[PDB]
Symmetry: C2
Subunit: 99 residues, 2 copies
């Protein structure tokens, strides 16, 4: 699709077998989701945003279907205000900014 | 252009004769810049994102050129580590997300 930007670009995602919604965020290097269960080993990481740093758990090679499109990559879990799909997964669906 | 997301989508911006660079950020409601000596009145307000909140000065009706495209809109000036072009200005240049 072509998504205009008059409202937040929220889309349906499927992760962990569950439907959620998340913000397509070209300003985020990687993907950060609110607290949830994911498979595999996690590693502690710090990530920085506009207001400072937060602690997250990093999971590797996680499957996420974004508007029906498959992506596999790193997913961070932590106290983000909103679920964010960052560039590491946007690239996997061929997302581009067009003007 | 049609900008992929393998690297941060930084573009040239021009305000008052000053050339800077800024991140095209679909995750931001607002545009947040470094100090640019914008003349005129402002309104203080708080914004936030990952990591917490920051104080900004809101300046309206700022003329900005973003990757060559002229726009007019509100700019928030505050202690952001990276200049961010948010949706309020992405809409004005006709920017969409596509996949």
């Amino acid at each position: 699709p072509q998504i205009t930007l008059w409202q937040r670009p929220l889309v349906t995602i499927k992760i962990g077998g569950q439907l959620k919604e998340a913000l397509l965020d070209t300003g985020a290097d990687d993907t950060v989701l609110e607290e949830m269960s994911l498979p595999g080993r996690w590693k502690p990481k710090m990530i920085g945003g506009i207001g400072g740093f937060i602690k997250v758990r990093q999971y590797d090679q996680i499957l996420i279907e974004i508007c029906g499109h498959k992506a596999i990559g790193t997913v961070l879990v932590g106290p983000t205000p909103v679920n964010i799909i960052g560039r590491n997964l946007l690239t996997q669906i061929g997302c581009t900014l067009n003007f």
